[PDB]
From Swiss-Prot, chains B, C, D, E, F, G, H, K, L:
Belongs to the SctF family. This is Type 3 secretion system needle filament protein. The lineage of its organism: Bacteria, Pseudomonadati, Pseudomonadota, Gammaproteobacteria, Enterobacterales. It is found in: Secreted; Cell surface. The helical filament defines an inner channel with about 20 Angstroms diameter and has an outer diameter of approximately 70 Angstroms. Deletion of the last five residues prevents self-association and yields monomeric proteins that allow biophysical studies. One of its GO terms (molecular function) is identical protein binding. Changing residue 33 to A: Has a minor effect on IpaD/SctA binding to the needle and partially reduces invasion and hemolysis.
From Swiss-Prot, chain N:
It is found in: Secreted; Cell surface. The core secretion machinery of the T3SS is composed of approximately 20 different proteins, including cytoplasmic components, a base, an export apparatus and a needle. This subunit polymerizes and forms the helical needle filament. Interacts with the needle tip protein IpaD/SctA. Interacts with the export apparatus components SpaP/SctR, SpaQ/SctS and SpaR/SctT. The lineage of its organism: Bacteria, Pseudomonadati, Pseudomonadota, Gammaproteobacteria, Enterobacterales. InterPro entries: T3SS_needle-like, T3SS_needle-like_sf, T3SS_needle_YscF. One of its GO terms (biological process) is protein secretion by the type III secretion system. This is Type 3 secretion system needle filament protein. The gene is sctF.
Length: 81, 82, 82, 82, 82, 82, 82, 82, 81, 81, 82, 82, 81, 78
């Protein structure tokens, strides 16, 4: 839960992204274990592909958002002088 | 479960739409495979099994390629955040 | 909402213009996807779906790149306020 | 079932079209087979059995080749999605 | 409809051009398929069906490849906006 | 111990399904082969041996082709990970 | 009507130079595409169409890359004003 | 050796997970390969060896693709330290 | 017809292939007409077979050469940036 | 012998296939010499046919296995980048 | 050694801490490289070498980026001495 | 016209060095192409053409990559003038 | 023999890859000459296939490793300024 | 076995290594054109033709593999 208000941190944004994507992590873990059991089921492969792609997208979005907010903060800081 | 270009639909939703869009094929393939296991010499059984297997292969390839393309588009859009 | 190099047009306005300017294509894509999920074996259906998917990918890439370019120009103009 | 080049027809449609269009031949072949297994000595019965069996074999080969060609075309069109 | 290198033509329009440019072949192919289903023994019918099937396969492959090449060119051009 | 289009089944499961689905044929073939090796002169024995051999050959070819097709599909799906 | 390293030429001039320099090839490509849509079975037609398509793709890529490089040079020069 | 999206797991852990998750298949492959090398004429042996080899190939390809994807994600995250 | 010099194109290369193999096309057409008139003469069949084989080889060679040159040209283009 | 472990190459696989069916080469050579000496014994012909078929199957199996393993190894390499 | 934001710790000390944290990986990489040079065809060897190389690359990139960030912060603090 | 790591050598000089160093190859390729166009059925001619074409492709790719690398290094050195 | 320590270069890495694979080069050259002598022995063909495959894998791995190390070095370089 | 050998050199090596067999094939072709009825001549011609086909296929495949490896090495320059 992040709102553009007084109290929220970058770590708060990272935890917000992590908690928003919670079912996908567990489903990816289950699919990974199932694939390790037998890597020949087409349905298993398709589900694992979808889960891995969504996980990659989530990681990239989180990292880019944190980088952009850090750049904004750095830009604002230098105006002190 | 239907996918529409609107606010909410994910890759998992797309895969579920592909799976549930053609569900009769999986059951027909199962039945044909069981019949072929019973007697693998009936020409009609062989023809039906061939048709079902080919359609299943096409469905799987289409699903995988669609998922790949949508993932590529999503990855391309994200990189502009910086 | 038309976008003109004038006083009133924002980044969200540009994105909405890109979305509205190509709306029937999204409906065609939805219909093609539903019909393909119904039966993924019709050659004409497959070709139409390929065309729609290609158009959608190009549209998304163009929209994202245009938004990025406009944002870069705005950021470049900002740093000269001092 | 008759297949036309339109938006809705599958490989199963082609198989069922080949099955339904050539339908009296299977019945005639079965009848000739029964009447020949009863007494395999009549030259006319032998000639009719030969004709029906040849037509049945030709029909099966044609159906298999058509299904294979259509499946190959559909698979080729799929690859260009990505 | 034709798609000359003017400002008004799209990938879906190119696919429509490829389709409507060769529409007699679809009807001839389905007529030959119906006739073959009726009787799979006439050599002339078999030759006509073979020719129609080969031409249809070539047309579909050419259309798909052309659409893919045009999509590749469009994607390559777009990514230079950034 | 059968194969269903669901979450859990592997290629070895498909091979086991193909092998165990038609198990009487192997025993009948072994017995007919032993009898033929004992004395190859009775027409009924020869006909039974021919039928069993043909059915076994068809079963083996069908199993191999199905396994190869499933392998191709699985290989196709894998490549889209990256 | 050409582009030279002098005091009057812009990016639109470069694009017009690239387009006007390759004008007969576009017409030949259009004619080949129309002929192919009329009948996609002439090997000479296929070879000529392949050559024209390859030349068109190379021309588009070269034009886009040249415009991008010149824009990069101009942007790099600009940022040294202050 | 369990891979979970938690604090403690690395790429080598992923490789070990993929390896140890598929252990009996390696032993079955060894036994089948030895039996085939001793006498490569048993159809059952050939089918089993084919299945085991296909499963091993799929496992290796999936492991490599997963490792590459995770490496790409980690490299993307690292660059943002800048 | 085609020299590694300033000006020669893919269409020019295809025209070179067409011009180099011109007698064979006419011989094949004449043999095809003769076969259509009467497909019984063994010499006619042998000559038609030879001409058809040469035509197929020529077409394959032309297509492969065009493909390879297109690949080379596309590879060179990417380095403009 | 070859095990999916640290030490085994493609040459190891080829030598494994050769050595496993090692008596077959000697049996085939002896049968070939006996056949060339007098090609009229039905039992000799049957034995030679069996040995030749087994040799052909062994060669095909070895070639296909080596090809598949090489393909897997090459596919793994491309992910180094 | 230990690296805490306390009274005494240096950038070179930070680099040495980063090196010492990753010490087993260097030896494993040496062993894998030597074994691959011995025989560059073992799939297990290739997978292990890929994992070790990826982890080494990530470690080097992270170390360099952290050192650069710390140097930038220190330079920023220095400039305000006056 | 030899490229030496000293005061005087440019990108054009490097490209001309690549061209001049391998000039008999182009003549051999031209002669082979002429012979093939005369009659495209001689196996020795086909082998020689394959060898020459492969060598030419490798030469062109190496030249382009070397030019790009040197240009990148030169651009990197220039940027530090300010 | 290369160690991630103070003294080792890219040229040293390539030389290590070359020297480590010395038996394979000799066996490949011998097999190539023997095949040029006569391309009929099945054993010769199998050995040549194995050697060629191993050589291809070794070259690909060497090139990819050199590229990766160069990429790491280039990435570290830019942090100087 | 050194730093100086090209694809053309490889093709020349393959051609020159199998040179007597091509001459034997040409002689057998002339003899067969004389009279296509000698069983020994037919068997020899069959053997020579099979050997020539195998040699051509092996040469082409080797050249293709070496070219692929060289092309793969080039792309890693940048």
């Amino acid at each position: 839960v992040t709102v553009p208000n007084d109290d929220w941190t970058l770590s708060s944004l990272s935890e917000t992204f992590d908690d928003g994507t919670q079912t996908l992590q567990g489903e990816l873990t289950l699919a990974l274990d199932k694939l390790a059991k037998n890597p020949s089921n087409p349905q298993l492969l398709a589900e694992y592909q979808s889960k891995l792609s969504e996980y990659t997208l989530y990681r990239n979005a989180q990292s880019n958002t944190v980088k952009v907010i850090k750049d904004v903060d750095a830009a604002i800081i230098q105006n002190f002088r």
